[PDB]
DNA sequence: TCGGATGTATATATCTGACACGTGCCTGGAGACTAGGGAGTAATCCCCTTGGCGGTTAAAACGCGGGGGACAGCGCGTACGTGCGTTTAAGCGGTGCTAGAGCTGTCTACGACCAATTGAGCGGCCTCGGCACCGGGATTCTCGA
DNA sequence: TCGAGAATCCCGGTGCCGAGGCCGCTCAATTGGTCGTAGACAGCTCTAGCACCGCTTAAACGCACGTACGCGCTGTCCCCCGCGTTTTAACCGCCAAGGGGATTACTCCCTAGTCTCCAGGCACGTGTCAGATATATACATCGA
């Protein structure tokens, strides 16, 4: 039973933000369920967007539109900006 | 001078507007409102007639549902008139705010 | 503005369809506000849908998809 | 020699795992190269905001370890995160302490 | 070479087994689709359509009309206690609302 | 363009032989059929993903029907589905 | 020989159970109720302690939200004590019949 | 008769957590009824998931799925 | 407004049990190369959406009773807080143990997949009967008396 | 009770346009073969859910007394309904155009696919400190 989770990555994010804090096990299980829910939500919206336009590929445009649809205003703007920044840096290197 | 008692001309029209399946809002002002609201999102937009018709139908259904809920709220407070506090009560219980 | 195009008789007719006997004077402005909020919410999603398709026309599919997104599925348009 | 896609994008969340989950989820026939990067970036930003609010809410209680109660407080207190997670129940989270003004004497 | 008997006729249905199978395959629901899944789904859809159309026709007959209109659909959905909650989050265009006036509001 | 129009018309005539249906009512019926189809198919796919299954069979559709249809509706729907599946297999 | 005036002990409690997160319902009675309810669906059906705890917490949260909604409905009616009509109004506005 | 196992002070505690000052007598019975309805609805889907899984034990993940299908997403169990 | 008596954080020692850190290994994520198919680009061209003009009038805006309902005040008696003894049962700890979930090993029947091929379903054209509408009449609420 | 008045159902006659049927006529659903493989089936393991059993104690409860307030009654008064009068812009029909939403043809480049290897992250073991808990103290408040 090789169970996969987001423990290490979310811990890295916390150390990036708050270097002197920790996550309890129940709180970390809640984090994992939050990230899984958001991931499946965005992926489902992107799949719906691709199927609505007779398109058979999930690209960055679909994820951008999905995150613009689901997240609230300033959250959507910040998420879109950060995602575009990450995509450009990945493309450059 | 025959004067109908205040109140009968309410339930009378209520039977009519519940028996009918019209849209109860003038189409041109609602289309203008939709164009104005969408102007704040993208400049120089075009709307299909089916799109504005669907928007009008959805707003119609939403508003009649909200009016039913606020009527229930006003009845609960031992009143007949609907007042805005009933509106925010219904919208808050419905999870909108 | 154009929110005043939703006239007082229109609000009265909507309340009558909802089954309301007496309307207070403050109902009309609040109804206009909530209608504006709902229309903004739906139109934001519809316009984002029509941007994603690289289109400058808002079709009925965009509107019905936006309505379905807020759990307000609409039958009769495609 | 091998460099992970997460580091190549300057990110912490796994781009490879996100790509594999996009393939495995039957979401679409094909997955673009940059779609997992964008999705991982969005998830990383959301987690960063959630962890920041959880951390400073926990520090408000003089606790250096974040518990589900701190998560609930952080999510409910923020306007936009509350809207995003309005229909979400956090286990062992509780509710915001609020009493209506009429109830007070 | 034998006669091309349709799958819907083979299953004694009216909804398309082949079209539902194609939509299930192209809908990206699963990597593979079983043989009996389109038949089962077509049967369920046909039963639901039959129930909706039966109640709509009854409502139309109550209105002395022969052709079915969206108002009859709305009446059929909102009068039944199960189709209403199945379709509680949907709106029927031009269907209106079912007549209902609260007893408190009535005079005397 | 794909539409259940002839199919809904056939079902109507089977149930109400002397009853017509308007174009708007037919469109609403088509929208209802599409909505129920996508809902049941999504639930079946979700079940297959939960149970680590790569295919959707009559079991997944049956469980999706039982989940998405309340009470008597689910019972009669699964009855008709089982009848059709048994007729098709034989 | 003193006595706390009505109203203060309600808040000494409302604050206590709002600032602290607990389960507020005894584990074994709720587990027995869950098993009794599940008996009507499948016979001799086993459960997991994690599933029982999840049902526990979900029920707690559901009732807490319902109680906030019904409290607000009661306050709307110029009242303080919550009546069953308040619960019925909240459930009807939320759409839960 | 385990519906009475949810005692009156339990409903009182839940109301206090929700922020309620005074309680009527019928509140206990009404809350028992609504809780019974909610548990019946959730457990029906949980048991259906268990049936489709060919299992005889209701895991917490099935309860999470049943709650998610009902529009009440649950975090902290998977 | 205060003597005073509570459940309100505050100040400090003791376990202690979850938490974060070595660790190792195997398995999924990177590099490397093909190809071939989904998708961007280009042209086009025809639908349809925007725009605006004139006529009709149904609908909206406005003003004026005035009456019925929203709201404030009082009385009451009735149900709902509060200590309290108890008794009722609920967590808390320990073990038995066994149905049952989870992982393995065949291998078989079932699901793609591709080459005809054909009939069922879709697009366009009548075409007439359902239904909308109008106009006069019988019929049914209504509200002052 | 009741009758003039005002809606309201009803029925006959007229029109007109969508529902329905028919006729080509593509294209995608059917047949029929292989080809691989998902899970069907049987089996072994070990694990955690069920049952008991007793203990100690939280709390549920049934019962009293005081009283806060939910509700009904009285009264006021005010604002919203009903109707008549006066705009007015919504609606319908029409015409013009341009623009952009679908299409068809052509590359083309990007990702699925397959082979190889390695490093990272997850299961395991473990020393450690964040925090619950026990004990005594400042302290914002119901009655005269």
Author numbering:
A (entry chain H): 32 to 124
B (entry chain E), G (entry chain A): 38 to 134
C (entry chain F), H (entry chain B): 24 to 101
D (entry chain G): 13 to 117
E (entry chain C): 11 to 118
F (entry chain D): 34 to 123
Quoted passage from the original study:
The nucleosome consists of ~147 bp of DNA wrapped around a core octameric histone protein complex, containing two copies each of histone H2A, H2B, H3, and H41. One of the most common forms of DNA damage is the baseless sugar moiety known as apurinic/apyrimidinic (AP) sites, with an estimated ~10,000 AP sites generated in each cell per day. The primary enzyme tasked with locating and processing genomic AP sites is the multifunctional nuclease AP endonuclease 1 (APE1), which is a key component of the base excision repair (BER) pathway. During BER, APE1 functions as an AP-endonuclease by cleaving the DNA phosphodiester backbone 5′ of the AP site generating a 5′-nicked BER intermediate.
The second nucleosome contains an occluded AP site near the nucleosome entry/exit site at SHL−6.5, referred to as AP-NCP−6.5. The APE1 cleavage rate for AP-NCP−6.5 was 0.12 ± 0.01 s−1, which is a 3,650-fold decrease compared to non-nucleosomal duplex DNA. To determine any structural differences between the three AP-NCPs, we obtained two additional cryo-EM reconstructions of AP-NCP-6.5 and AP-NCP0 at 3.4 Å and 4.0 Å, respectively. In all three AP-NCP structures the AP site adopts a major conformation that is intrahelical, though we cannot rule out heterogeneity in the AP site conformation. In contrast, the damaged DNA strand containing the AP sites at SHL-6.5 and SHL0 make extensive interaction with the histone octamer. The AP site and surrounding nucleosomal DNA at SHL-6.5 interacts with the αN-helix of histone H3 and is in close proximity to the C-terminal tail of histone H2A. Subsequent modeling of APE1 bound at these occluded AP site positions revealed significant clashes between APE1 and the histone octamer that are incompatible with APE1 binding and DNA sculpting. Together, this indicates large-scale structural rearrangements in the nucleosomal DNA and/or histone octamer are needed for processing occluded AP sites, which explains the moderate and low APE1 cleavage rates for AP-NCP-6.5 and AP-NCP0.
